[PDB]
């Protein structure tokens, strides 16, 4: 196997394609995979087997070593000496064999994961357009992310399904004094514990899945709040929002608490089993014959080995192996989906023809396009219009071959260049998007970008052609994104060009220029099809097509339309001034014209009350498990004293469990408190201070830190308690038996501490790389999915495959480095442990072990100490991560006439002053407003009033200085509607009234007053309707009206309007102006405008530049000074 994506893919593709091609009904992915996997997997598997079997040998060697100190036979010093050497070598050898093999298995898991991802990516790009709208988008994201961190670890235990029975059979077969079947008492106990644990684990999974759903809901509300803190504070909404967080948190905790107990008992059960395998193991020796130390010591070491292979190594592989298989099956189901059918290019024609085409998207469809017919000559212009939904763009999908006809033929000449309704961001270099996938030629490039009028905006970009367009499209406005899409479609040389919604939400001035610049001249003599709403284009076009309800309304010459459907034509022409209508209005006009011319609980409470019931229930489980083991003992089918002693052990263990329950209760309580305090602290936080993270670390730390406290503190703490108790005992005993061991062990612990510290520093830094390399794999994926229509149209598939592989190689390189440093670290740790072991074995061998039982116990304690020690190393690592998280969390928590005198503001106490020494007056009830350049800090005046800035000077509102008024009422006076309107997700009643203070009747009254009554009636449920995704179903004008309704219900006196005109079309902007003037007849309205035409309705003006301002009492004085100062 290879170490890179390209090679890994070739091999997987060859086997997959060969089997898939060999069409034996249902070819399987699993077979393609075993043919890759098996020849490496099996080798690491056998090496691990050989490594593990060492544990089944070591106790035998000790029994003989112990015997050498017996008074029996002879004091063969030389044998004790050499056997001791052999024992320490067994430790060294398995260390040297096992770790490399584990590493190799992880290497394999990684290689397979990469091969699987590349296969899936290739498949998504070839999917049929029909199934494309049935496959939930969340499923493809989870298809790749769900096993991202599981698949590659899982192979580590896979060969244990195979090893486990070999070691169980051996250890069983090695039992000394086998017929007195202590073997069954032993196994019956362990077997029962294993099934108990399996069941418990299943319950754990049930809780994880349900909790995950609730987590996503909490996270969504959380980020919604974080990115809009200014509106929450401005609204003085505050604690209502805090309560929304609380209800989501409470829901998660109820589920978490139950999950926590599952984890608690799992761990205490583990402890319990330790005690009993040892206890039961000595029942033979108490029962008749008595004790033989030679055999007792040997017996216990073997018992320990069975416990671990039986209860942990085996079931871990079973669960892992099973889940891995299910994941593969899901991948296969995805791969076996209908394909995009390739278009056959030919030299049949020069034009475009459609022969009686009838077609539809899916079964059960009524949207069947009927009897579609075309004959377009080379170089002709086709203009198409019609009702929304009557195959306005679905026609294009037939043209490009995305949708097959059910009947009829489609003929085309050559290659097609397509520009979709919705622009594809293509994150990356802007020049490259314009000329993407093709050679750069300044002749053509300049001609296209100039003709498309891109220079007007692109030359303002900081790196010009090399300005990179990042995620979110932070560089371009929607009309600009559209403009680039056109330039891209045009730059590509094609025989046929398809323009989807080319008007681009652009200003009519540029719309005209682009049509003539591009449609007429740049595209001259090309075969063109335009989607359009403008009658002028139809007049110009050689062929006119109008669609309605799945069929042709009209197809032919412009004058033929008028002669054959004159009523349709006359109704449209009544709106003669179509250039004055925005696309939205043009669409409404045709839609109407065209449709008009149709042609447990009782006891749970008692369990909480009576702790004696809890004790009994704990004891009941213990009793039950021992009785079940008895059922397994009866396997022999094909004493009172023992009964008494085991009964005693059960009672003692039950009390031990009972004592620790308050810890679970305490743990849930603590994480709840921390989450709640952090939220409170962020809401009632100073402004500017949060700008240290700028919402990045705020969201990431808030989300991640809570998650780790909940999953790890309740887990790692119990392991630490058990490990701590074990080491205390181990050291105490050897220190007493032989003080030289202590002398020897002190430097050993010192060695481990130093290496650990160095390691963690570096590995913690490397961990950052996984996130850095991981994020872009998904950004790449999403971008490719949205761009699918053009990736196929322009033949760019291999370009993107190349990019995808480079991203994978980056990720794997960092992932791999992280893995490698960890493995090296663990190897070093184990070797240090191996060395002190040898030294200890010899301290005991060398000294006067004339009372041999003391020799025996030192040797077995040392031999079996390594299991606990490996856990201890890992637990210390987790602890350091937890403490670092705790610190990160802790860092956050441990006047009608408005009179402004000498006001000054900054974004920090250092930084820069965004405003200095401004004085300004607003007469009560006066309409006033602001003028200034974009980015002149317009919003910093509003924020200065809302007290969101580091500030100086005297502002008198509601008769008093801000200096004597707390933020809530100072801000309460101000009803502000920002350009970026905040929409709270949820029920409209709460969105409008998060406090529940207004009645439904009152809410409706205001909805009527502000013009939103029809809007709320339209949404099903009305007040109960749930609004989602930032108001993805609302006009931004509606969002502004919702804000208005809030301002009037809130009884604000100062109304602040942040350029409504920035986004709202005048057809509605005037409606809101009328509406608010009536609503605010007794209030003072302050407007911040971008144009003189809007500011014009104000009586007093504030003109701001360079952190200074000029106050005018008349628009004329403003204009006289503005002309002099128009700079
Ligand atoms: N792949 C698809 N499978 C099924 N239905 C589809 C698919 N793509 C689009 N549609 C739907 O079926 C119709 C297809 O027609 P088309 O895409 O031409 O509509 P349009 O008038 O261009 O749409 P709009 O302007 O609302 O975006 C639409 O009304 C749309 O809701
Ligand atoms: N708290 C802040 N800290 C740092 N920079 C800020 C802060 N608030 C805004 N800015 C920036 O400084 C300028 C402030 O001007 P303001 O926020 O009034 O701009 P605008 O013209 O309303 O901007 P837009 O059209 O992007 O909404 C902007 O150019 C913006 O990038």
XYZ file of C-alpha atoms in Angstrom, residues 88 296 303 338 397 553 613 706 745 809 882 936 944 962 1038:
15
model
C 12.460 -9.728 32.452
C -1.573 -19.597 44.883
C -6.856 -15.108 37.010
C -28.684 6.451 -10.110
C -31.943 21.181 -17.684
C -48.495 29.478 -24.187
C -34.227 1.845 49.093
C -19.005 22.802 27.816
C 11.625 3.530 42.405
C -2.903 15.107 1.663
C -9.080 19.293 31.471
C -17.306 56.924 8.546
C -22.265 55.824 21.651
C -26.072 58.985 30.980
C -40.819 42.519 7.063
